[PDB]
């Protein structure tokens, strides 16, 4: 029952790949520290111009399949 999500936010999709990078940068924080100490770095991220699009692009590629999973596309 259900499965197709609807994409990840620029902050999420990056914090996802970097969330891992955050706990490494601080092997003693907390799930919530990753989300906070990441945004600070993310805001001024040069991979955000190239990653922030993953989020907006995924929102489209996902809603185009995840949302359109029933009909077709």
């Amino acid at each position: 029952s259900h499965m197709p999500k609807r994409a990840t936010t620029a902050f999420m999709l990056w914090l996802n790949d970097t969330r891992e990078s955050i706990k490494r940068e601080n092997p003693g924080i907390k799930v919530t520290e990753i989300a906070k100490k990441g945004g600070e770095m993310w805001k001024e991220l040069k991979d955000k111009s190239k990653w922030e699009d993953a989020a907006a692009k995924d929102k489209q590629r996902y809603h185009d399949e995840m949302r359109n999973y029933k009909p077709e596309a």
Side-chain angles (χ1 to χ4, degrees):
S1 317
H2 314 256
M3 226 261 295
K5 313 144 185 143
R6 253 274 278 292
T8 338
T9 8
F11 195 22
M12 275 260 34
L13 105 249
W14 145 98
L15 177 68
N16 230 337
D17 224 79
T18 250
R19 138 171 286 271
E20 68 203 40
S21 309
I22 323 216
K23 228 92 111 279
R24 270 144 66 162
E25 288 260 53
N26 302 265
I29 73 190
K30 73 182 303 111
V31 7
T32 49
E33 159 132 24
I34 307 142
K36 297 298 299 184
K37 99 86 114 202
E40 55 185 49
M41 79 166 112
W42 154 265
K43 281 305 221 200
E44 295 301 277
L45 169 86
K46 269 158 143 76
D47 263 56
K48 197 230 276 205
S49 196
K50 38 177 98 101
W51 282 41
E52 87 320 348
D53 203 59
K57 87 174 59 183
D58 280 33
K59 90 122 94 266
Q60 133 116 144
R61 149 182 85 161
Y62 255 51
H63 86 324
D64 183 81
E65 317 240 89
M66 324 264 99
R67 116 212 240 72
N68 265 277
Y69 79 117
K70 269 166 152 143
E72 212 56 87

